[PDB]
Enzyme design. Structure first.
Site, mmCIF file in Angstrom:
data_model
loop_
_atom_site.group_PDB
_atom_site.id
_atom_site.type_symbol
_atom_site.label_atom_id
_atom_site.label_comp_id
_atom_site.label_asym_id
_atom_site.label_seq_id
_atom_site.Cartn_x
_atom_site.Cartn_y
_atom_site.Cartn_z
ATOM 1 N N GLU A 170 0.991 -1.200 0.056
ATOM 2 C CA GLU A 170 0.029 0.029 -0.206
ATOM 3 C C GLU A 170 0.822 1.165 -0.086
ATOM 4 O O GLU A 170 0.429 2.052 -0.557
ATOM 5 C CB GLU A 170 -0.926 -0.051 1.339
ATOM 6 N N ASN A 172 -7.521 8.932 -5.835
ATOM 7 C CA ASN A 172 -8.360 8.078 -6.651
ATOM 8 C C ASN A 172 -9.449 8.756 -7.733
ATOM 9 O O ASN A 172 -9.559 10.087 -7.564
ATOM 10 C CB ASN A 172 -9.343 7.457 -5.831
ATOM 11 N N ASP A 183 -6.334 8.335 -0.628
ATOM 12 C CA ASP A 183 -6.025 7.171 0.519
ATOM 13 C C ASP A 183 -5.017 7.783 1.055
ATOM 14 O O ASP A 183 -3.796 8.481 0.451
ATOM 15 C CB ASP A 183 -5.359 6.078 -0.460
ATOM 16 N N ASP A 185 -15.262 -4.708 9.110
ATOM 17 C CA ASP A 185 -16.590 -4.251 8.344
ATOM 18 C C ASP A 185 -17.313 -5.512 7.554
ATOM 19 O O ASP A 185 -18.428 -5.152 7.127
ATOM 20 C CB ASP A 185 -16.232 -3.108 7.455
#
Length: 129
Positions: free
Chosen positions: A35, A46, A52, A101
């Protein structure tokens, strides 16, 4: 801050990320490697206009506030800048929410594409943990 591999492993362990939601420490280190290349100040814009942030490339569409992502949420209740700090606490606390999540670490596309199903223990091999 650009962490070393074993240095980041140790910080993640201290903050309870190791084996969190069943994901071993090497999974987290591998995700950070791909990442951010271990750079807390990493950012990536993005196509949708979200950004991000930080060592785990946490996205402003859902997780943090940057003031410049319309209709977005802030589910970690933090400014996105908090995710760029040398201290990884905010990133770790928010990553715990993300990975809880429902989709596990598949939330991190670089993890799915570059870490999932690989020898992720290599990322912590040798480290004094």
């Amino acid at each position: 801050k650009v962490f070393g591999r074993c240095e980041l492993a140790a910080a993640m362990k201290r903050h309870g990320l190791d084996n969190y939601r069943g994901y071993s420490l090497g999974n987290w280190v591998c995700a950070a490697k791909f990442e951010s290349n271990f750079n807390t100040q990493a950012t990536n814009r993005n196509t949708d206009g979200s950004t991000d942030y930080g060592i785990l490339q946490i996205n402003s569409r859902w997780w943090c506030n940057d003031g410049r992502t319309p209709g977005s949420r802030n589910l970690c209740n933090i400014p996105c800048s908090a995710l760029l700090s040398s201290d990884i606490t905010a990133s770790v606390n928010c990553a715990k929410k993300i990975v809880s999540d429902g989709n596990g670490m598949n939330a991190w596309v670089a993890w799915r594409n570059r870490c999932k199903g690989t020898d992720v223990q290599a990322w912590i091999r040798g480290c004094r943990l």
